[PDB]
């Protein structure tokens, strides 16, 4: 198609059968199809474990550094990958995140507690 | 923490659609109950 | 080729169209009609958002109260409830010129440009004003205005340098080994050419869009 | 209050005017409408210039309004706003002056300080306290106590009003209240931080009774709580101040009486504009009437009080001033008379060249 406005962005691209995902990290005009017509190819992210138990992400970051200096927008996803492996830092949600789960098993560890005093009420009952 | 005046001047600004403050979290990963 | 026919009623259309566009402009007091009993744009049938919905009934717009005042307000300062509540610091504009539209019965709407001064901060020249149309302005009373402009600055505190990532960081330390330059000196990055602006700061007016004429 | 040389026409009718016939000068105007095209800043004042009876005001009304909602309406000269109440006085037609005045977003009618005073001061001598206040809360919405001449006949015209109003409604309160206190603000005698103190009695008032917003919407007033405490303010100021300065008796019975009543009571715009940090104003009304008593015994003590009611003391004050602003106010309108006439001829040479250029325009096309 010939496009008309838009911007360059590097996103994450699905391919892979059905249950089985796995991501191309490309650079691609942002109004293309998700799995259609990008720029570059910047990488790969598969995010199913190996054998070893790892998640494998490619990223090649002397492409990527080029695009980002030409403008390029990044996808949420693709910014919380920067930010896991170091080279951006943890995205503000991420960090968010991770503490509203640490509130919500505070909350399950102290209802379990409760729980167990409220069955020691029941041992105490006989 | 935020400053005690900038969470009374968001209270203001959602009056009427709060929610209850959420003070610090936990220093480290609560282990799951199991 | 040679068989790519001219298409003159294409031509005929697009400038035809284009013509009664200009012709029959919408005016500011049209576009900018208000149903208060629904809150609803009589023009196109937009309703506002429900966090407007407050403030619509209980602010004024800016030439509404410039209406009121003589030489249209010219050398006054306007205010925003929005950013008295959201910013401690003096934030207002200068008028300098003010386009009201006549066509209005009342000259409530209309066009106006000033000197933006916002956080305490002033900028250096005029221009046009957004959100003119928004139920939020305030006029500053002219005995109340050297208490309201009164404006001391604080030494910035905001960081002007901070870390690299963790990874970015190791391959510019890397770098260095590997051409020679051995220092155990910090990689810092500066933030102070690239620092943001407020997410309320006024935007140009000049350069934003404005409705179509077609009812809906 | 002023005097007949204040309140004399013969400069005005003495100015240099065209003679243009209202018949075709409407006609010019109409047809400029009829293709929504500009009119003129010297045509509407030609209008004005040659009224020559009752029936020619109502037209000129007309055509007022019709320049108010035109594109060039910002246009409107200063003279022309002076001429139409000089017009309308001269034909008794005060209440379209008035009229006009009030419906200033319709007519535009802004006049200046010496044109407000000719009209204040003849209900002043006619006896008609109730539009002479109308004027002066005009000139309070305008923020137009300039002039010293303005603000002794402003505050003679309130006190004089106050004293026959027993009961005050809300709405008075808060219009009193604006009015006394920018008057006020203005002079620095006794009468002045009389009517400074008098003034802000009366918004806190309506500020702790119907809410800080009543006082400050629509208002040449601020919009911070706390009108009670720039009242003790102004006893505390000049009971500490270095300088021999007084306050009426009557008004600090006022602000006593307001403390006691508010003391002892008994569509979605439903808003709290203040930060929960901070103490409302019903909180701390304990510690304003401490501070009260304080500032009165202070004040009794050290024989700043004026028992002389404010009436008395702003009629000896008008006497004594007002004859010399007049002189000052009368120099300076010869002046103004002079750079309209002046300005008034450069837009009459710039029209003619314009049309004789549109001659050669055509004899070109
Ligand atoms: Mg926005």
Sequence with gaps: ?126 | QPPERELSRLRRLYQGNLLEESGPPPESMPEMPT | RKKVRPRLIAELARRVRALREQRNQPRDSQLYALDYETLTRPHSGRRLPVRAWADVRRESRLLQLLARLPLFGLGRLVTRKSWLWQHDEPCYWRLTRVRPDYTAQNLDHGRAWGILTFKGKSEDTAREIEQVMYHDWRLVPKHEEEAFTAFTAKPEDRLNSVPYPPLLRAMILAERQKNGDTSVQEPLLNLERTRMRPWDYPAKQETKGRAKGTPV | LLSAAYVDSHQWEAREKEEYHLADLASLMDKAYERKLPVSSLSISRFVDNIASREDLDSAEYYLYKFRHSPNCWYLRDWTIHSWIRQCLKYGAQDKALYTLVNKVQYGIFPDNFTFNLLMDYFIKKGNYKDALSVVFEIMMQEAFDVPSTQFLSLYVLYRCLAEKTELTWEEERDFGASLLLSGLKQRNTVGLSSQLYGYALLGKVELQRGVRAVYHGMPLMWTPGYLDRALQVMERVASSPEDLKLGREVLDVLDGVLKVVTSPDGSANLVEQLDTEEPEQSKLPRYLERFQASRSKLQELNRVESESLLTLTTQLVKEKLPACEAEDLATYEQKLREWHLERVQLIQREQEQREKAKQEYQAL
């Excluded at chain 1, 998700?34 to 990488?43: I, S, T």
């Excluded at chain 1, 474990?49 to 998640?55: A, Q, V, Y």
């Excluded at chain 1, 002397?62 to 980002?68: A, G, L, P």
Aim: aromatic fraction near 6%; charge should be positive; glycine fraction near 8%.
């Design chain 1, 1 to 126: 198609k010939a496009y008309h406005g838009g911007h360059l962005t590097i996103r994450l691209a699905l391919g892979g059968c059905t249950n089985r995902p796995f991501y191309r990290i490309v650079a691609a005009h942002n109004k293309c199809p998700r799995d259609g017509r990008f720029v570059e190819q910047l990488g790969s992210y598969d995010p199913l474990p190996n054998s070893h138990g790892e998640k494998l992400v490619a990223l090649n970051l002397d492409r990527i550094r080029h695009w980002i200096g030409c403008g390029a927008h990044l996808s949420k996803p693709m910014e919380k990958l920067l930010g896991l492996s170091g080279f951006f830092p943890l995205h503000p949600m991420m960090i968010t995140n991770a503490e509203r789960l640490r509130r919500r098993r505070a909350r399950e560890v102290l209802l379990a507690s409760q729980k167990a005093e409220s069955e020691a009420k029941e041992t105490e009952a006989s």
